[PDB]
Amino acid sequence: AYTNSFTRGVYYPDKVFRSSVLHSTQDLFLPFFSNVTWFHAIHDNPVLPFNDGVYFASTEKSNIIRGWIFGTTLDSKTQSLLIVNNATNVVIKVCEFQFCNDPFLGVMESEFRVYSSANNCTFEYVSQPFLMDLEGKQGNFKNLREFVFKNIDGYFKIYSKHTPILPQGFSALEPLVDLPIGINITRFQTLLALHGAAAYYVGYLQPRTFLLKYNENGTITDAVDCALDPLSETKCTLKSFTVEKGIYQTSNFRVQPTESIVRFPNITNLCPFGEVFNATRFASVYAWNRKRISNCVADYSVLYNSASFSTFKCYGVSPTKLNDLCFTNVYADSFVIRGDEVRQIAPCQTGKIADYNYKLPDDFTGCVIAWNSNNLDSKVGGNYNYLYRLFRKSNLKPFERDISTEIYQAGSTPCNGVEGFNCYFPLQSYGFQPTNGVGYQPYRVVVLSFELLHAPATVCGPKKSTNLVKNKCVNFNFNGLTGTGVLTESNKKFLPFQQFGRDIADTTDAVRDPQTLEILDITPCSFGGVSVITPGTNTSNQVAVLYQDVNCTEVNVFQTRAGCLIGAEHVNNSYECDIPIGAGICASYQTSQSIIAYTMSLGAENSVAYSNNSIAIPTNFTISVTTEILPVSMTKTSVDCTMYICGDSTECSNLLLQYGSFCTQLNRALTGIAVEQDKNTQEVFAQVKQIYKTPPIKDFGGFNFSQILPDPSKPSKRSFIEDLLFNKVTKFNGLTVLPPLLTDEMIAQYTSALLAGTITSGWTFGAGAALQIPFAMQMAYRFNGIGVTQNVLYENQKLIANQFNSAIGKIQDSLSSTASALGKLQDVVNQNAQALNTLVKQLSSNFGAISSVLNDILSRLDKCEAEVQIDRLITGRLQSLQTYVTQQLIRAAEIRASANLAATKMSECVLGQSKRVDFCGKGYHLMSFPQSAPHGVVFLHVTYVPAQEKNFTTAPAICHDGKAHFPREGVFVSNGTHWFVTQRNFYEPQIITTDNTFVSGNCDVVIGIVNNTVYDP
């Protein structure tokens, strides 16, 4: 029997109290909704494997489940951990136990047969007594007792949780004792008592990342298994349990290799290392021998595991990797030196050996092997067969040899055949005696110089080759060069000395197979980003997954050029875009209900009824009010670089001074930003020299402004709409926020002055003094400014006022209903908060240091060793600030551009009237009204929009007495029997006379001229 692990197997990852925070951890947890094997026992228990840790749970009524057994063979050949809880005292033992064929404890208890012997036992612990169930008693289960058992680096960690009552629910498991048992555990058994039904559950852990949500009381109340399904992955990626509608990038799909491929040259001869290491005679260091090792199979584990060597230093390579790696050539430079001089045979050493007899490159790859000698290289009366160069006019270049018996003139005395003062021989010899000290006894040293691969390899380790599989993603190893990818046939032509090809990035593009000299292209196996297409979690938890730039064969299912989309049904009908996918495809949650994918609609299809003699002239109009929301400012943050990087630490601050001016230039940049935030606010709102006020009696021709003018009854003299706007938009690490210079009240006063000016004086307050004008006349000018004769307003003034008032009411209802109306300002707020939250979290990063807590380094390390860990933390906290500041400067530039635009609109939309199309809202602009909002400005743009139209016949000109008459303003229209001239944006036909039209030329040139009569008053 099996069941579904219903939200179980989560434990507290550590012993740190956290609250009201979501913490992400990767460790071995039981995944949510996994299948768990369910066993029941009436009145026996199998042996299970112990993979990487086991989740165990039980429901009890008679305490049948008593303990667990852990080990490898469980037969007295290895050590085995035994834990028993037999209702009274928990007993833990680690013995080389002999277990029975059927382990049990009797149930009043009358047996003890869990093991049969104790021998070479290493650990025992017994707890205090308690009382639990002991008798056979049936019923329903009341106590769910959950456990986690894992072994990490010899520490056997037991977690558990007891709860009254797989049941559905969530419960985190707290830690219990941490036992240093140090045993390799591969097997497991549970322990049941023999006389009563007592179920237990067994699960297994795999390496998973979990997101743990700690509540206000610090108890883990829920969790997301970040590797369960696309929705959980999305939630873990965003560090939140709620996901808004949209497309998120949560991970990356990567095809895994199926098998490994090991390819090496087919040589089986073994390398003559014994004739080098066990040689009869070593050369002297002035004339060291160099044997080339090639065309053989080498084995450096035999030389390495052998204990005969006194010193073993590898530069560039590690001794355990030498078995896999292989070389074009290996050279063994063999010579004897004095013991205290062993240190000089190393890269970047100087001395009488390093400069005169054996110089290594300072970029040396290989191994220095040395051992003491006292049987062969030393005698009584000393061994005088060993010569070294004692004087040379200049030092040695790497690996140069230079045999010379020329007597060395130390001075200017050209002796030229006789040794003397300042004329010595360069060759000197020290002797070796069995009675000499450690530093003066002989040592045999062989340095193995490795040429790492650049040409066909000939010296490879004992690793056996494998067969080669083409056209599949494999984990390959070609002559020690490793990587993963698909190997295909190629048509490239390496020339005979070339073995490898490279890409621009220096990665291998193709290789020549060492067994069959053919060229194989290496293309890494298909991969790409994975995006999760989801409606917001308040609607549905169903998601669709987009695998970017792949065909889905490699992975109902719909293939598009953005990738293969799985879980969304392809719908032939187009609609407006909701959640964009890419390449013209959008997805939405629609109708039971499911996610759909479709080709985006670009709008309704329409054709214009164009003809050479037909014009559409509007007969009615609508006054619309639209909302344009612009950022103006962002929070004026200020960061003390010293407290952030080096909080309350003199040692760190003194280290920070070695980085110079990085602090004051970051403080400078942020100060500059804060200043520009106040300048931006000042430029948008403070362009009016005086604070204007409305009269107490609001006689504005029927236009109701009570919802945009200040209401004196509030603690802050804001308009009703402004209050709505303010109700929609929502520090001890050296991080502060400066207040703005202009308080919200001051902004409200500026917008009030601008509104009162606009209402009572039109555009005149912008140019100079505020010149009072009736509001209806102001509108008359605004209508005239858009090509609509002013009488249209007066004749329809009441209607216009009602439409305005209704438009305003809709604005309040819209603003009062949904939160999304202010998204442009909220995103700015969110971005700034997000930048700071990222900045704060970066203090928790180690950056390679032993701890992210600066005080913990200082309290543990003395200053000098500590200096490395602290400069390493600074090297990262400074980068975090530079990244933050750079992003703030760029974001500030974006805000400045927006603020400049807002100021431009204020000047051209509110203070004047704009002829720029769609600059001050859609439609023919009349007026605009500023309203303040958090860190921004809201403009209410009042526009004239034609509403109803008729098809009229037209003509560009009318012939009368042979003369061509053209409109002064407007067009000629005909209702089918009579010609009239009328204004373009509003149907208002008038009789054609010589005072509405003008005469130019003669009716024989103009294309489309028609016959009529023009009445002459």
Ligand X SMILES: *[C@@H]1O[C@H](CO)[C@@H](O)[C@H](O)[C@H]1NC(C)=O
Ligand Y SMILES: *[C@@H]1O[C@H](CO)[C@@H](O[C@@H]2O[C@H](CO)[C@@H](O)[C@H](O)[C@H]2NC(C)=O)[C@H](O)[C@H]1NC(C)=O
975 binds, among ligand Y, ligand X, a second copy, none (CB under 5 to 8 A by kind): ligand Y
**Position among 116, 374, 395, 620 found at the interface with ligand Y (CB under 6 A):** 620
Contact segment (CB under 6 A) with ligand X among 51-59, 88-96, 184-192, 680-688 equals 88-96
Site string for ligand Y, 766-805 (x = CB under 6 A): ---------------------------------x--xx--
| Strands, sheet with 997-1002, edge to edge from the N-terminal-most edge strand | 997-1002, 963-967, 958-959, 1010-1011
Do residues 870 and 854 make contact, with C-beta atoms less than 8 angstroms apart?
Answer: yes
Which candidate, 49, 46, 68, 47, places its Cα nearest to that of 57?
68
Binding mask 932-971 for ligand X (x = CB under 6 A): -----------------xxx--------------------
Distance of CA 650 to the CA centre of its chain: 34
* Cβ-based neighbour number of residue 494 at 10 Å: 16
Stretch that binds ligand Y, among 96-104, 306-314, 427-435, 702-710 (CB under 6 A): 702-710
Per DSSP, helices labelled H in 43-181 are none
Which residues, 6+ apart, have CB-to-CB distance to 212 below 8 Å?
Answer: 10, 13, 22, 23, 24, 25, 172, 220, 223
- What is the C-alpha to C-alpha distance for residues 360 and 362, in angstroms, rounded to an integer? 6
Pick one of 6, 500, 575, 726: the residue that binds a second copy (CB under 8 A): 500
Nearest-CA neighbor of 379 among 338, 435, 423?
Answer: 435
Does residue 206 interact with ligand Y by CB under 6 A?
A: no
Q: Segment 118-147, which members bind a second copy (CB under 8 A)? A: none
Q: Is 66 helix (H, G, I), strand (E, B) or coil?
A: strand
Binding residue for a second copy, selected from 53, 366, 461, 480, defined by CB under 8 A: 480
| Site track 572-611 with ligand X (rule: CB under 6 A), x = hit | x------------------------------------x-x
Q: Which is nearer to ligand Y, 421 or 1015 (CB)?
A: 1015
Pairing of β 958-959 and β 1010-1011: parallel
Interhelix angle 863-905/823-841, nearest 10 degrees? 170
Among 186, 311, 409, 953, binds ligand Y (CB under 6 A): 186
Q: Under the criterion CB under 6 A, does residue 516 sit at the interface with ligand X?
A: yes
**Residue 1011 binds which of a second copy, ligand X, ligand Y, none (CB < 5-8 A, kind-dependent):** ligand Y
Instruction: Go through the chain and tell me how many residues it has.
Output: 1017
| Nearest to ligand Y of 561, 978 (CB atom) | 978
Binding residues among 169-208 for a second copy as defined by CB under 8 A = 174-175, 180, 182-184
Residue 64 binds a second copy (CB under 8 A): no
The token pair that represents 546 in the structure block: 């987009």
Of 771-830, which residues contact a second copy (CB under 8 A)? 771-774, 776-777, 780-781, 789-791, 794-795, 797-798
Closer CB to ligand X, residue 412 or residue 612?
Answer: 612
Neighbours of 844 (CB within 10 A): 8
- Residue list 978-997, contact with a second copy (CB under 8 A): 984
d(CA 120, CA 79): 9
Q: From ligand Y, a second copy, ligand X, none, which one binds at residue 436 (CB under 5 to 8 Å depending on kind)?
A: none
Could you give the CA distance from residue 519 to residue 536 in angstroms, rounded to a whole number?
A: 51
With CB under 5 to 8 Å by kind, the binding choice for 704 among ligand Y, ligand X, a second copy, none is ligand Y
What is the rounded CA–CA span in Å between residue 346 and residue 443?
Answer: 15
Q: Does residue 1008 belong to the site contacting ligand X (CB under 6 A)? A: yes
Smallest distance from the beta carbon of 822 to ligand X, in angstroms? Answer: 15
Q: Per CB under 8 A, which region of 117-125, 434-442, 461-469, 474-482 contacts a second copy?
A: 474-482
Give the total of residues touching ligand Y (CB under 6 A).
16
Q: How far is the CB of 184 from ligand X (least distance, A)?
A: 17
Answer whether 527's CB lies under 8 Å from 253's CB: yes
Stretch touching ligand Y by CB under 6 A, among 216-224, 388-396, 570-578, 970-978: 970-978
Report the candidate in 595, 559, 598 with the shortest Cα–Cα distance to residue 577. Answer: 598
By CB under 8 A, tell whether 678 contacts a second copy: yes
| Amino acid present at 492 | K
Chain residue at closest Cβ approach to ligand X: 538
Least Å distance, CB 154 to ligand Y, is 11
Which pairing describes strands 979-982 and 958-959: parallel, antiparallel, or unpaired? unpaired
Q: Is 556 in the site for ligand X (CB under 6 A)?
A: no
Tell me the C-alpha to C-alpha distance, in Å, between residue 259 and each of 470, 515, 524, 863: 11, 19, 15, 51
743 binds, among a second copy, ligand X, ligand Y, none (CB under 5 to 8 A by kind): a second copy
Tokens of 992: 């054609």
Bridge-based pairing of strands 473-478 and 260-263 is: parallel
Start-end of H helices in 206-324: 230-238, 274-277, 300-305
Q: Which one of residues 138, 612, 650, 713 is an interface residue with ligand X (CB under 6 A)?
A: 612
Task: List Cβ neighbours of 977 (8 Å cut-off, separation of 6 or more).
Answer: none
What are 985's two structure tokens?
Answer: 């944006």
Of residues 76 and 914, the one with the C-beta less far from a second copy: 914
Contacted by 659, from ligand X, ligand Y, a second copy, none: CB < 5 to 8 Å by type: a second copy
User: Given the rule CB under 6 A, which residues bind ligand X?
Assistant: 2-3, 35, 86, 88-89, 91, 109, 120, 126, 216-217, 266, 273-274, 277-278, 303, 515-516, 536, 538, 551, 553, 572, 609, 611-612, 616, 697, 699, 949-951, 1008
